[PDB]
Amino acid sequence: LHKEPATLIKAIDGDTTKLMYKGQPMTFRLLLVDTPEFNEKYGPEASAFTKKMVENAKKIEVEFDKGQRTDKYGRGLAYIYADGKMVNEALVRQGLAKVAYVYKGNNTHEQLLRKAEAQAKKEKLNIWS
Ligand SMILES: Cc1cn([C@H]2C[C@H](OP(=O)(O)O)[C@@H](COP(=O)(O)O)O2)c(=O)[nH]c1=O
Ligand SMILES: [Ca+2]
Secondary structure: OOOEEEEEEEEEEOOEEEEEEOOEEEEEEEOOEEOOOOOOOOHHHHHHHHHHHHHHOOOEEEEOOOOOOEOOOOOEEEEEEEOOEEHHHHHHHOOOOEEOOOOOOOOOOHHHHHHHHHHHHHOOOHHHO
16 A cells, blocks of 8 residues: 545544545545534544644545445545554544445554554543443
8 A cells, every 4th residue: 555645725623534536626534434413422523633634734645455445425535644643543642533434455554543443442532441
């Protein structure tokens, strides 16, 4: 897997963001995670977490997996990095997301994220409190 550049266009919520990728606007859905919707508990905290992480990064990168790159709604499916740090993993580690939507072929970082979730659960963080 490799990292490609992109720039923030607009925050959306805990697990979606609007980025410019190869010069085109595109909504990205974070692979392998599920944040609560804004209207649910920890939803606002998830949204703020991602918003802040992505907007403070001076460099955003997009990392596609091996499988599908677009979902059925036209969203890009990727791991997103903020100055070298993976947002997908950071959400889980803080208990602001659950590992989820694990499909074969787009699951490279699965174990890495389950490791993060196991530690978040261990600490009773946010969703696991
Ligand atoms: C994360 C992810 C979601 N999806 C689809 C499955 C879900 O379908 P349904 O809409 O039929 O429930 C939806 C969940 O995303 P959200 O959590 O953004 O709603 O997005 C994929 O197809 N692949 C993925 O990798
Ligand atoms: Ca969600």
